[PDB]
Design an enzyme around this catalytic site. Structure first.
Site, short mmCIF file in Angstrom:
data_model
loop_
_atom_site.label_atom_id
_atom_site.label_comp_id
_atom_site.label_asym_id
_atom_site.label_seq_id
_atom_site.Cartn_x
_atom_site.Cartn_y
_atom_site.Cartn_z
N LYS A 124 -4.12 -2.27 -0.94
CA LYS A 124 -4.89 -1.75 -2.17
C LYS A 124 -3.24 -0.67 -2.51
CE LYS A 124 -5.61 1.35 -4.05
NZ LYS A 124 -5.47 2.87 -4.42
N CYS A 144 10.24 9.53 -0.75
CA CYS A 144 9.70 10.20 0.47
C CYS A 144 10.77 11.07 1.36
CB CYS A 144 9.12 8.92 1.50
SG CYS A 144 10.43 7.82 1.77
N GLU A 181 3.03 6.97 7.48
CA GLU A 181 4.16 7.38 6.66
C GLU A 181 3.87 8.38 5.74
OE1 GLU A 181 7.19 4.85 7.99
OE2 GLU A 181 6.43 3.22 6.61
N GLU A 214 6.70 19.68 -0.33
CA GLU A 214 7.27 18.46 -1.00
C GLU A 214 6.84 18.70 -2.61
OE1 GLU A 214 5.58 14.65 -0.39
OE2 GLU A 214 7.31 13.97 0.20
#
Ligand SMILES: NC(=O)c1ccc[n+]([C@@H]2O[C@H](COP(=O)([O-])OP(=O)(O)OC[C@H]3O[C@@H](n4cnc5c(N)ncnc54)[C@H](O)[C@@H]3O)[C@@H](O)[C@H]2O)c1
Ligand SMILES: NC(=O)c1ccc[n+]([C@@H]2O[C@H](COP(=O)([O-])OP(=O)(O)OC[C@H]3O[C@@H](n4cnc5c(N)ncnc54)[C@H](O)[C@@H]3O)[C@@H](O)[C@H]2O)c1
Ligand SMILES: [K+]
Ligand SMILES: [K+]
Ligand SMILES: [K+]
Ligand SMILES: [K+]
Lengths: 494, 494
Positions: free
Chosen positions: A180, A289, A255, A388
């Site tokens: 997905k 990331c 992650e 972030e």
């Protein structure tokens, strides 16, 4: 070009969402809907896991050898290298990432499958590895078998690469899967469906459901016949998928990105290091990331570094991704655009200095474009320092002591990556050791090779993908120990 | 003799619960409160993690080498072997397990620390292991560092062994820990606190909070400064602790027990196998995580196997644990006693046959004693067939086909262990491969060696403890990759 209408890839063939809903794909550069993707819903997940479970049960893939699956892997890698041009273009228009970056991505997916073909091959002959027991009475070895049906959920910042980071190890291990991908970047992934048919992947071995997180992903993770979830995405979402997986005590790898520091000491060639620092926080349009989005530079070179810094970034061709020479495209979406923009507003509002950028470009009047941004006069209390941003936005602070660089670097709940610059290598080793982090770059920032283990700690998650760790997340480590004595246990009485 | 009136072990010294509450310890054999243990509460967890975090920060344990920690490990093992008699006693009265079993436990804890002393030693020189990259430009290795502060939560069925299964790898890796043993069996574990002081473990490196699951354990797992949880217990509880850990995306290993099959084929000497089947389901008073509590015997030997079976178990000396010759003690507690009894009642009520036991012994009038029990005329629909009983209670069904044995064995949500008996070894291999399980015994049942990886799949949980996998659960696998070229990345323009 013509994006394609495409459908749900389930059991080797193209299927329509049971509720027949679809969602726009949109060029980040033009704000224009340039196409359409299926919008899988829970009911589609059902048929998908079923196909996957059936495929797993066939004596056709899962009980196959690693060397056998390695050929499909090797073939997929070949096919991707073949239809290269086609993929890299689709990926550029879907992601908004500079065409030159997309070329790397696609080379990287090919290379990823080839590395895991190797892994699958090494899997064999790890099989029945002996473990030595004290007694002589008992013998023992280890089998490494597929866990079964796995749900893979990946982000939009490297559509196919991030997906193959999961697909390749999953298939190498003998699992079947439901992918997905992000609703913000599904085309290459959907296009991957064809590749499977073209290489002869049995049906149901890889299934591809596109759709929204809540509608497609959530049901994937909570499904009672999915044995394991591999998730990459935001920490907030990670928490949600792990709580869902907890209902069924289902294994999970997470992650989750972060707020990675780049610490630069006095003794550095401030012109290269400056080039990285830009790479570490602006490339992929700031959507990394492991983005080294916090610069801790020694007061010594502080001014200068920052100067060459603003000079270099001033130097970055921000344009439409296809335009030759383009070193910076639009962020992925309207929502992300707004979010990044707000981070900037509240950073001014909080009293930081926008020492460059912080605004729309100028030459670009449409598309989600944002200028590489440098912000200073930072407090460790301000949002921009902790949160972030996932846009082209860099924060700068200076330090006096070495262990102040250290304390300041570890001053996050995150713990994905870090980058330390210094020609004093004994200083580098000392810093790499102290960083509360899963990946430390020494005198560079961002190079991520499929050969090396990859993941975070703290709020950045857990588990290691890639390298020799990747395949392990999809295996049942089975102990088998047998009695070879043919004597009675001799514990009880007859 | 008298038990050990201890307090909580925190920062190397004995502290009193901040709320000063305590709870009974009770001889399973006498129903008699024979002592008293501290009842840690969330406030105690706070000071405990704090001690642990401080201890981790000290350049005194965590950044130490493996070989260095291996000596404390080796020392602990020695001390335990020394104070052997004292421990095995205390364990026997605390657990209700036959003295002869206890003996083994204590040898096993000693042996466990020694094995992990080895592990910690091997840890060194795995450090900076090189990973080969394509580009000459970059060099890469792997560091293996402690994750930080870990919470360890263990069960009462092997009080110290189950605890050292966690303590040993945790310390070997360089982590500091908070141990929370079962409220039904804390004395040996509390007594372990002294051992640490005696071997000179720095303060705060191992902390021991006794108390109830909800009051002491829950706060341990949800605490914001505990980096990782290692849990062993029931699947129901596992789900809770994983949901809590998900709040903070905290890593977790779950060992959750099961409903393991033992399948016996025609070609076996049904006296040796019969002894195992008893061992697999009645030893440790039936309280075995991997208990082979479902017998799938071939109709051929069906009658006769069961006969020798009832004969053998009829031969088991059920008595007080300290009584010489005792091969079966009382279950751990009144609550467990009630639960096991109820499982028996509702099994009768559901229509199964109690072909032996199912009731209190006769010679024993006090204590939580329950007869080894054999039940037949089983439906795969009955509760006794699905639910882990965790008492000396065995279910028997027969099979015609090989793959009917297989289907019937995999017919649970659990997937911890399994045991297959047959002198046809080609048949054995085939079955071991097919069992949806984490550990497969061939021609035995229950032997668990610290050398081999141990854990389950499905509702039995995930992760592997012991062997070469044990230490891994407590490490940050840190990638470090450095640029050795001195040249500019060359991606942007100066
Ligand atoms: N550590 C890494 O390997 C890594 C690499 C790249 C990016 N990232 C992270 O990825 C994030 C950006 O990706 P994103 O915006 O696509 O992240 P996201 O959190 O929105 O979700 C990622 C994936 O999860 C799906 N999802 C969302 N909600 C779900 C739910 N409730 N249940 C099941 N699935 C759900 C999403 O639709 C998408 O496919 C960034 O935070 C970045 O830090 C991490
Ligand atoms: N798989 C294995 O390796 C293994 C080994 C031994 C036992 N077991 C299993 O252990 C179970 C029996 O042990 P048990 O009765 O101690 O299990 P349990 O689930 O009741 O609790 C076990 C431990 O967890 C603590 N705990 C309870 N609730 C908690 C909570 N909400 N939060 C945090 N901690 C909590 C308890 O105090 C105890 O110390 C059985 O199901 C058995 O199969 C499994
Ligand atoms: K898009
Ligand atoms: K974590
Ligand atoms: K007790
Ligand atoms: K599971």
């Amino acid at each position: 070009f013509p994006i394609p209408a495409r459908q749900l890839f389930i059991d080797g063939e193209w299927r329509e969402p049971i509720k027949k809903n679809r969602i726009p794909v949109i060029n980040p550069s033009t704000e224009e809907i340039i196409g359409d993707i299926p919008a899988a819903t829970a009911e589609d997940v059902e048929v998908a896991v079923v196909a996957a479970r059936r495929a797993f049960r066939r004596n056709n893939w899962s009980a196959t050898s690693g060397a056998h699956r390695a050929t499909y892997l090797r073939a997929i890698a070949a096919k991707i290298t073949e239809k290269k041009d086609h993929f890299v273009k689709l990926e550029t228009i879907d992601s908004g990432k500079p065409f030159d970056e997309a070329v790397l991505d696609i080379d990287d997916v090919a290379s990823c499958f080839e590395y895991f073909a190797g892994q699958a091959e090494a899997l064999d002959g790890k099989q029945k590895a002996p473990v030595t027991l004290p007694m002589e009475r008992f013998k023992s070895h280890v089998l490494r078998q597929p866990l079964g049906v796995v749900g893979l959920i990946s982000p939009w910042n490297y559509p196919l690469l991030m997906a193959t980071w999961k697909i390749a190890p999953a298939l190498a291990a003998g699992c079947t899967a439901v992918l997905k991908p992000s609703e913000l970047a599904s085309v290459t992934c959907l296009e991957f469906g064809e590749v499977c048919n073209e290489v002869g992947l049995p049906p149901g071995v890889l299934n591809i459901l596109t759709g929204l997180g809540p509608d497609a992903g959530a049901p994937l993770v909570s499904h009672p016949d999915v044995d394991k979830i591999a998730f990459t995405g935001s920490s907030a979402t990670g928490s949600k998928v792990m709580a869902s997986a907890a209902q069924l005590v289902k294994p999970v790898t997470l992650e989750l990105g972060g707020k990675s520091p780049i610490v630069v000491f006095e003794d550095v060639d401030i012109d290269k290091v400056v080039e990285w620092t830009i790479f570490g926080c602006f490339w992929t349009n700031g959507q990394i990331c492991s983005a080294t989005s916090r610069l801790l530079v020694h007061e010594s070179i502080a001014a200068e570094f920052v100067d060459k810094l603003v000079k270099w970034t001033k130097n970055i061709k921000i344009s439409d991704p296809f335009e030759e020479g383009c070193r910076l495209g639009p962020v992925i979406s309207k929502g992300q655009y707004d979010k990044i923009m707000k981070f900037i507003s509240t950073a001014k509002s909080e009293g930081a200095t926008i020492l460059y950028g912080g605004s729309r470009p100028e030459h670009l009047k449409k598309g989600y474009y944002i200028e590489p941004t440098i912000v200073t006069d930072i407090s460790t209390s301000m949002q921009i320092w902790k949160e972030e941003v996932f846009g082209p936005v860099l924060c700068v602070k200076t330090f006096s002591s070495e262990d102040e660089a250290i304390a300041l670097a570890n001053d996050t709940e995150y713990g994905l990556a870090a980058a330390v610059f210094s020609n004093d290598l004994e200083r580098c080793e000392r810093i790499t050791k102290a960083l509360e982090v899963g990946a430390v770059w020494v005198n560079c920032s961002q190079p991520c090779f499929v050969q090396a283990p990859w993941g975070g700690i703290k709020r950045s998650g857990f588990g290691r993908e890639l390298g020799e760790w990747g395949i392990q997340n999809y295996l049942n480590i089975k102990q088998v120990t047998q009695d070879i004595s043919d004597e009675p246990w001799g514990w009880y009485k007859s």
